[PDB]
Amino acid sequence: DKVMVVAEVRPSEDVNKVLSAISNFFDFEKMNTRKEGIIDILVLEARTLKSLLKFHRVLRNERILDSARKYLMKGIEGNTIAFMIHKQAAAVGVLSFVAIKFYIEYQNPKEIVDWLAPKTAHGVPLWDNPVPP
Amino acid sequence: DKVMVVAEVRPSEDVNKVLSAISNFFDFEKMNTGIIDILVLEARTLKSLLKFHRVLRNERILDSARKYLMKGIEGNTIAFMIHKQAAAVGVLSFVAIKFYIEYQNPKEIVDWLAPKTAHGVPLWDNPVPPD
């Protein structure tokens, strides 16, 4: 029941700018770094979906719930949801789906899509569920 | 007549790492700066490419450089690119880092930087072209 974000850091990149871009939407708890040549790979993890509260908030402040529901629904596979957001956009405080990789381990994935990406009527959320248990 | 290097600096990149990348092969005399920054570095003397000149010989890639440099000639300019990440780690690999050289006799630049070779050895060793 954890979330994991993976992102690369090339030699011209500043590991702290990548982590800071991710912090905009993810309050990670753990971090290990791995390599694939001259490229570092960040694997960030958190145990609770609460770690995605800032993600929940941005989808609303940006008014892109419509778009987020399709990307998230499409990203469901089994008991996991996987999606990607634009890295540079993220670096400037903007969330845009498409890189920063997100992986969510949860039994009822659908409850996650509805929690942060509800259907909308004229931009207004048709419902506002609490963070899934 | 000048040497100019242009490189992008994305929000996730460190301008210092990109400047260091270029520093491995070029010594700028001045620099200028959507959500992406464009770094423009330039020099007025060809001595600014002495590091480049040294690396092609040390790593013994003269043949490869001549090919890329010669084809890079258009009119009185020479245009070519090198790999950003490779350059960030000190490696010179020809293609995001763009080189633009203005000079009235471009082939001289090429023969200075990348002499034709026979059996892996430079057939000539010209001095840096004037200016």
Author numbering:
A (entry chain B): 2 to 99, 109 to 143
B (entry chain A): 2 to 34, 38 to 99, 109 to 144
Question: What's the publication's text?
Answer:
UPF0201 family proteins constitute one such uncharacterized, archaeal specific protein family. We have further documented that all members of this archaeal specific protein family share a common polypeptide chain fold, which is evolutionarily related to the RRM motif found in the ribosomal L5 proteins and many other RNA-binding proteins.
For 10077b and 10077c from S. solfataricus and S. solfataricus P2, respectively, full-length constructs bearing C-terminal His6 tags yielded crystals and structures. The loop connecting β2 and β3 protrudes somewhat from the globular domain, and the electron density corresponding to this region is poorly defined in the 10077b and 10077d structures. Pairwise sequence identities among the structures we report herein range between 15–22%, with exception of 10077a and 10077b, which are 35% identical. Our four UPF0201 structures represent subfamilies N149845 (10077a, b) and N130963 (10077c, d). The crystallographic asymmetric units contain one protomer in 10077c, two in 10077b and four protomers in both 10077a and 10077d. While 10077a, 10077b and 10077d all form one type of dimer (typeI), 10077c forms altogether different dimer via crystallographic symmetry (typeII). The interface surface area for type I dimers in 10077a, 10077b and 10077d are 672, 563 and 611 Å2, respectively.
